[PDB]
Amino acid sequence: IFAKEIDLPRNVIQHSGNKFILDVVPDSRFPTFAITEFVQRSFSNFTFEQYSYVSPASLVGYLVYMIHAFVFLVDAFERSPMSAYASEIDASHAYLRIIDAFSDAYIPDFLFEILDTYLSHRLDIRSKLEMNVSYGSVLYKYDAPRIVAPSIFLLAHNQLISQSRESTAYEKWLDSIVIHYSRAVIRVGNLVGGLYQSTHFTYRNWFARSLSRLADSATHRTHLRRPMISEFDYNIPSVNNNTYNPYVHLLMLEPNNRNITLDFIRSLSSFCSTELKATRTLRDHISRRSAAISRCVIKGPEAPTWHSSPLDDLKEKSKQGNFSQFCEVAKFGLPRKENSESYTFKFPKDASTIDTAFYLIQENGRSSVLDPTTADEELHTEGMNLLFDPYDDESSAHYATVLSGKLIQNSNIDGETLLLPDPTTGLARTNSRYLQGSVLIRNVLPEFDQHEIRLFPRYPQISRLSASLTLLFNMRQVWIPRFKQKVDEQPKLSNFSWNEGCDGTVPSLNVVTAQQVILWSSYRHVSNSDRPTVDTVYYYSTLELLFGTRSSMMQTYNLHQLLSLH
Amino acid sequence: NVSYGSVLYKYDAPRIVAPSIFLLAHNQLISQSRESTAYEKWLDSIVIHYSRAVIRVGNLVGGLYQSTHFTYRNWFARSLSRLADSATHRTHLRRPMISEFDYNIPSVNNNTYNPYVHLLMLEPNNRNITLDFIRSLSSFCSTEL
Amino acid sequence: TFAITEFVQRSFSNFTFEQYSYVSPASLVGYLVYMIHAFVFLVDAFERSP
């Protein structure tokens, strides 16, 4: 009736938002686990006599290699613009020969079940928000054990051949140096979490129990039943913060490794083609597009499968260790430290000269009840996962989600605040609210540095009603009022939530504005096109500020409780 | 009905055959040793600690005593010794990949002994190995037996 | 256990165990003794009242 009079399609302001690239970095421990179990159940059907490099370790390293190769091809040929890590790889003829080698290398149909979840995606209404997979946000002390280096499996190939009749033959593999990171010898036992010291000890977690089968030389007579055999002469690179490129390290593109890398790629591509009946490549697959990248696994506090402690060379035979002595070395779930009492606050001698409710220094009254969660095996190895899906509530589509490695691992964040729309501002700024559920990683504790992890618990959700928190006039900071001497009325101290008894050993505040936050996320954002720094990378603690609470949430087990080792 | 709800350890321990003895026999069956009687390292293997006491395979099968160690071959140990003798280890190493059971020895007493936890290997440092054991041998029985 | 060990003695050479890293005669005997005790737990937990 009033359609032509109001004429609202000709009387609106529309803006679809600014351009925003959302980076996805998969935790490669989970596809490595699936690939190792794939090779376990299929390798005896293969003929490897015409190959001097093919072993189970080499085949697992090839498939993990082709995952990282897919990531480089998406970041270099599909992301606009390409990341600063991929721009450092020169387009010279040697690099182009290796890129053409893994662009036409044959991949089995199993690995595309994982790789179809890494396809790019652009939202419908947010038509300038893009999700794509790239390692352009990767720092080594933040992401090193969650990104499985394929050079570990060449060393496992070297140990799988050796004619030794020792009991646990995978322990020389755990000694093998992978990289030098500026002053630091990082071994396989640092990245897989199977060898520590306090005398060397072996801890067999779910990742090392799976990978130890590839480097155990008790079955070396099966792998030596061939005319000609060779070993990988892998050269250990020395990098620092200024020269670390994850694509050069993961794709083995150092100048003293490019011939071995090329022979590795072509030998195992021919092996997959002739024996695994692999017919497909990555070249016709990096331009595909699907909404499966927005599915992720939400985890709580889990124990590491790594530690950053420096290991010496294994001279003797290693003993068997346990969970608690590993978590003391890995610095996970430590108790609350003791008050050293090095600083002293200035409390007045007369107590009637101040209003003591307005003075933040006690008379040594109440102590804190904040205690960290000590490392327990049932809590931190058997915790349940959540399956996130923004578009459909089907559990058959999370088969590839539990294998892929897209995850948000949240330990202590309980709330994220959304900026409410202002109808008086410009609509570009209103429709460009993209960094809402994100934390800048200046505040995020690194996992592969020598830091301590104390798990102060999230509040129990066993209340009777739902809770929320609303911020007035400014959400960017929480006000603490400072009063003048003569005020209008009595200030009521009922809205002040006190954190009684702080002594440097408990959290004093619970607000991170724009060391303290324990978070890893697959979903990231870099604020520029330069080298990723700690001031430019954001970890997304959730995607529900973007996709809503109307999205599907399903609860499941861990992958090692779902995929058995046989 | 059948239930182990009446089971005390000092009354019923050798008459209830623990399945963790055979994981240790699997560990000794693999080893590349050319010794004469190779089942005697299996008889040394500790099964459980019962409050102060190291109970071995030779205590539960009755094939290893001392008074110098001696081997007595009764009808139960003569049958079970064939599973842990590494004189035929070349038959069992004819495979691409092999692994050993990393079984952890539990320490129990009168207050904490549960026979279902011990027999079913349900200690917290053994549940992953138990799950892989069950599923691997169920798939083996399904495909071969 | 005696009967299971003699069962595995007379049948194990007909088996292909190459696709398994845990299968041996000792493991198969341990599996069958395990499933006896598992039957006992299932009867006591799901059928005995209480």
mmCIF file of C-alpha atoms in Angstrom, chain A residues 69-254:
data_model
loop_
_atom_site.group_PDB
_atom_site.id
_atom_site.type_symbol
_atom_site.label_atom_id
_atom_site.label_comp_id
_atom_site.label_asym_id
_atom_site.label_seq_id
_atom_site.Cartn_x
_atom_site.Cartn_y
_atom_site.Cartn_z
ATOM 1 C CA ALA A 69 52.388 -28.215 0.083
ATOM 2 C CA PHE A 70 48.633 -27.682 -0.300
ATOM 3 C CA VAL A 71 48.867 -24.850 2.231
ATOM 4 C CA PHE A 72 51.706 -23.191 0.297
ATOM 5 C CA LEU A 73 49.837 -23.500 -2.998
ATOM 6 C CA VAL A 74 46.684 -21.916 -1.554
ATOM 7 C CA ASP A 75 48.667 -19.089 0.042
ATOM 8 C CA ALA A 76 50.790 -18.437 -3.060
ATOM 9 C CA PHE A 77 48.280 -18.874 -5.892
ATOM 10 C CA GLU A 78 44.891 -18.111 -4.303
ATOM 11 C CA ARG A 79 45.341 -15.645 -1.436
ATOM 12 C CA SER A 80 45.177 -11.983 -2.470
ATOM 13 C CA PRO A 81 47.753 -10.889 -1.546
ATOM 14 C CA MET A 82 50.125 -13.727 -0.698
ATOM 15 C CA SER A 83 51.711 -13.750 2.744
ATOM 16 C CA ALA A 84 55.186 -12.422 3.486
ATOM 17 C CA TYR A 85 56.395 -15.962 4.164
ATOM 18 C CA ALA A 86 55.414 -17.112 0.681
ATOM 19 C CA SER A 87 56.834 -13.972 -0.926
ATOM 20 C CA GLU A 88 60.288 -14.912 0.388
ATOM 21 C CA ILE A 89 60.341 -18.039 -1.782
ATOM 22 C CA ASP A 90 62.063 -17.015 -5.016
ATOM 23 C CA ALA A 91 60.677 -17.860 -8.432
ATOM 24 C CA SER A 92 64.005 -19.268 -9.649
ATOM 25 C CA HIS A 93 64.291 -22.469 -11.650
ATOM 26 C CA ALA A 94 65.197 -24.748 -8.721
ATOM 27 C CA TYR A 95 62.252 -23.556 -6.620
ATOM 28 C CA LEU A 96 59.976 -23.763 -9.658
ATOM 29 C CA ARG A 97 61.169 -27.325 -10.267
ATOM 30 C CA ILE A 98 60.221 -28.341 -6.715
ATOM 31 C CA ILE A 99 56.899 -26.448 -6.892
ATOM 32 C CA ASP A 100 56.108 -28.206 -10.172
ATOM 33 C CA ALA A 101 57.105 -31.478 -8.502
ATOM 34 C CA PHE A 102 54.620 -31.213 -5.660
ATOM 35 C CA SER A 103 52.024 -29.546 -7.872
ATOM 36 C CA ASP A 104 51.855 -32.675 -10.054
ATOM 37 C CA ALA A 105 52.652 -35.282 -7.385
ATOM 38 C CA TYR A 106 50.043 -38.023 -7.056
ATOM 39 C CA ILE A 107 48.034 -38.096 -3.820
ATOM 40 C CA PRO A 108 45.788 -40.931 -2.556
ATOM 41 C CA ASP A 109 42.063 -40.446 -2.117
ATOM 42 C CA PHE A 110 42.331 -40.604 1.682
ATOM 43 C CA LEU A 111 44.285 -37.370 1.977
ATOM 44 C CA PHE A 112 41.677 -35.423 0.015
ATOM 45 C CA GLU A 113 39.176 -36.237 2.774
ATOM 46 C CA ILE A 114 41.379 -34.054 4.976
ATOM 47 C CA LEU A 115 42.277 -31.518 2.270
ATOM 48 C CA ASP A 116 38.641 -30.868 1.286
ATOM 49 C CA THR A 117 38.207 -29.181 4.665
ATOM 50 C CA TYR A 118 40.949 -26.670 3.836
ATOM 51 C CA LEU A 119 39.140 -25.176 0.854
ATOM 52 C CA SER A 120 38.621 -21.431 0.790
ATOM 53 C CA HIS A 121 35.325 -19.809 1.721
ATOM 54 C CA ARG A 122 33.691 -16.400 1.465
ATOM 55 C CA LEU A 123 30.551 -15.509 3.387
ATOM 56 C CA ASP A 124 27.311 -14.584 1.646
ATOM 57 C CA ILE A 125 26.248 -11.367 3.375
ATOM 58 C CA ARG A 126 29.761 -10.577 4.639
ATOM 59 C CA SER A 127 30.881 -10.724 1.034
ATOM 60 C CA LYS A 128 34.384 -9.424 1.782
ATOM 61 C CA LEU A 129 35.280 -11.773 4.640
ATOM 62 C CA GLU A 130 37.455 -14.620 3.367
ATOM 63 C CA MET A 131 38.652 -17.775 5.089
ATOM 64 C CA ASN A 132 41.706 -19.467 3.614
ATOM 65 C CA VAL A 133 44.553 -21.653 4.823
ATOM 66 C CA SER A 134 47.985 -20.037 5.132
ATOM 67 C CA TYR A 135 50.981 -20.267 7.439
ATOM 68 C CA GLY A 136 51.584 -16.517 7.169
ATOM 69 C CA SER A 137 50.720 -16.062 10.850
ATOM 70 C CA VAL A 138 53.043 -18.779 12.138
ATOM 71 C CA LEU A 139 55.619 -17.997 14.815
ATOM 72 C CA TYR A 140 57.874 -20.823 15.931
ATOM 73 C CA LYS A 141 57.523 -20.479 19.715
ATOM 74 C CA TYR A 142 53.737 -20.333 19.253
ATOM 75 C CA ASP A 143 53.129 -22.994 16.607
ATOM 76 C CA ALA A 144 56.184 -25.305 16.364
ATOM 77 C CA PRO A 145 54.890 -28.622 17.846
ATOM 78 C CA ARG A 146 51.392 -28.229 16.403
ATOM 79 C CA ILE A 147 52.820 -28.081 12.872
ATOM 80 C CA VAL A 148 54.364 -31.479 12.187
ATOM 81 C CA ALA A 149 57.649 -31.155 10.322
ATOM 82 C CA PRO A 150 58.046 -33.787 7.573
ATOM 83 C CA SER A 151 61.790 -34.071 8.249
ATOM 84 C CA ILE A 152 61.019 -36.039 11.415
ATOM 85 C CA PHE A 153 59.885 -38.923 9.225
ATOM 86 C CA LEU A 154 63.064 -38.955 7.138
ATOM 87 C CA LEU A 155 64.932 -39.508 10.403
ATOM 88 C CA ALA A 156 62.400 -42.221 11.250
ATOM 89 C CA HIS A 157 63.232 -43.764 7.863
ATOM 90 C CA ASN A 158 66.908 -43.687 8.824
ATOM 91 C CA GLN A 159 66.215 -45.470 12.108
ATOM 92 C CA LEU A 160 63.770 -47.976 10.603
ATOM 93 C CA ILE A 161 66.504 -49.441 8.361
ATOM 94 C CA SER A 162 69.268 -50.029 10.919
ATOM 95 C CA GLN A 163 70.347 -53.597 11.694
ATOM 96 C CA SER A 164 70.024 -53.357 15.466
ATOM 97 C CA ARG A 165 68.546 -55.961 17.797
ATOM 98 C CA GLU A 166 67.851 -53.602 20.704
ATOM 99 C CA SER A 167 64.579 -53.549 22.633
ATOM 100 C CA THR A 168 63.281 -49.997 22.126
ATOM 101 C CA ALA A 169 64.911 -48.860 18.894
ATOM 102 C CA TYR A 170 62.822 -45.697 18.475
ATOM 103 C CA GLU A 171 64.845 -43.891 21.151
ATOM 104 C CA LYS A 172 67.715 -43.043 18.796
ATOM 105 C CA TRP A 173 65.044 -41.452 16.616
ATOM 106 C CA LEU A 174 63.925 -39.355 19.583
ATOM 107 C CA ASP A 175 67.544 -38.139 19.898
ATOM 108 C CA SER A 176 67.689 -36.855 16.330
ATOM 109 C CA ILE A 177 68.102 -33.105 16.008
ATOM 110 C CA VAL A 178 65.480 -31.473 13.794
ATOM 111 C CA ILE A 179 66.405 -27.777 13.853
ATOM 112 C CA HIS A 180 68.560 -25.214 15.646
ATOM 113 C CA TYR A 181 66.401 -22.338 16.747
ATOM 114 C CA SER A 182 68.926 -19.582 17.417
ATOM 115 C CA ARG A 183 70.813 -21.228 20.320
ATOM 116 C CA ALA A 184 68.683 -24.256 20.948
ATOM 117 C CA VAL A 185 68.922 -27.893 19.920
ATOM 118 C CA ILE A 186 65.359 -29.031 19.225
ATOM 119 C CA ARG A 187 65.041 -32.784 18.873
ATOM 120 C CA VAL A 188 62.307 -35.210 17.895
ATOM 121 C CA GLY A 189 61.640 -35.796 21.600
ATOM 122 C CA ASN A 190 60.960 -32.087 22.004
ATOM 123 C CA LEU A 191 58.430 -32.019 19.169
ATOM 124 C CA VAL A 192 56.720 -35.387 19.742
ATOM 125 C CA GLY A 193 57.000 -35.420 23.540
ATOM 126 C CA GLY A 194 58.456 -38.877 23.988
ATOM 127 C CA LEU A 195 61.835 -38.258 25.584
ATOM 128 C CA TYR A 196 62.672 -36.019 28.530
ATOM 129 C CA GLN A 197 65.241 -35.919 31.308
ATOM 130 C CA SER A 198 65.375 -34.973 34.977
ATOM 131 C CA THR A 199 68.992 -39.858 33.086
ATOM 132 C CA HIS A 200 66.618 -40.002 30.111
ATOM 133 C CA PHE A 201 63.004 -41.162 30.333
ATOM 134 C CA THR A 202 60.426 -42.146 27.720
ATOM 135 C CA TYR A 203 56.810 -41.024 27.976
ATOM 136 C CA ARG A 204 54.426 -42.695 25.554
ATOM 137 C CA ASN A 205 51.541 -40.357 24.813
ATOM 138 C CA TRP A 206 48.954 -40.894 22.080
ATOM 139 C CA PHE A 207 50.999 -39.090 19.421
ATOM 140 C CA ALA A 208 54.352 -40.719 20.200
ATOM 141 C CA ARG A 209 52.756 -44.174 20.543
ATOM 142 C CA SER A 210 51.462 -43.785 17.006
ATOM 143 C CA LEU A 211 54.669 -42.378 15.553
ATOM 144 C CA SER A 212 56.999 -44.825 17.341
ATOM 145 C CA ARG A 213 55.900 -47.658 15.044
ATOM 146 C CA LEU A 214 57.529 -45.883 12.092
ATOM 147 C CA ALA A 215 61.004 -45.711 13.657
ATOM 148 C CA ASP A 216 61.291 -49.085 15.419
ATOM 149 C CA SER A 217 63.953 -51.265 13.817
ATOM 150 C CA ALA A 218 62.630 -54.544 15.240
ATOM 151 C CA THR A 219 61.053 -55.117 11.819
ATOM 152 C CA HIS A 220 64.063 -54.018 9.753
ATOM 153 C CA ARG A 221 64.300 -57.361 7.937
ATOM 154 C CA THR A 222 61.030 -56.596 6.152
ATOM 155 C CA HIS A 223 62.336 -53.259 4.890
ATOM 156 C CA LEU A 224 65.758 -54.558 3.813
ATOM 157 C CA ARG A 225 64.188 -57.153 1.494
ATOM 158 C CA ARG A 226 64.978 -55.142 -1.624
ATOM 159 C CA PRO A 227 67.951 -54.893 -4.022
ATOM 160 C CA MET A 228 69.049 -51.301 -3.341
ATOM 161 C CA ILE A 229 68.387 -49.114 -0.300
ATOM 162 C CA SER A 230 69.455 -45.569 0.559
ATOM 163 C CA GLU A 231 69.188 -43.165 3.488
ATOM 164 C CA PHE A 232 68.031 -39.553 3.557
ATOM 165 C CA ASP A 233 71.028 -37.244 4.004
ATOM 166 C CA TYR A 234 68.926 -34.493 5.572
ATOM 167 C CA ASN A 235 70.766 -31.348 6.648
ATOM 168 C CA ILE A 236 69.713 -29.631 9.865
ATOM 169 C CA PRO A 237 68.923 -25.933 9.319
ATOM 170 C CA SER A 238 69.857 -23.168 11.738
ATOM 171 C CA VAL A 239 67.268 -20.388 11.921
ATOM 172 C CA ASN A 240 66.342 -17.470 14.173
ATOM 173 C CA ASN A 241 63.464 -15.004 14.526
ATOM 174 C CA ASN A 242 64.781 -12.991 11.565
ATOM 175 C CA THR A 243 65.326 -15.913 9.174
ATOM 176 C CA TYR A 244 62.620 -18.444 10.064
ATOM 177 C CA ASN A 245 60.314 -19.165 7.165
ATOM 178 C CA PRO A 246 57.952 -22.071 7.903
ATOM 179 C CA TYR A 247 57.529 -22.889 4.230
ATOM 180 C CA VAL A 248 61.287 -23.322 3.757
ATOM 181 C CA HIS A 249 61.458 -25.545 6.845
ATOM 182 C CA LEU A 250 58.328 -27.617 6.194
ATOM 183 C CA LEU A 251 58.949 -28.011 2.472
ATOM 184 C CA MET A 252 62.713 -28.632 2.973
ATOM 185 C CA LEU A 253 63.675 -25.827 0.596
ATOM 186 C CA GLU A 254 67.081 -25.037 2.092
#
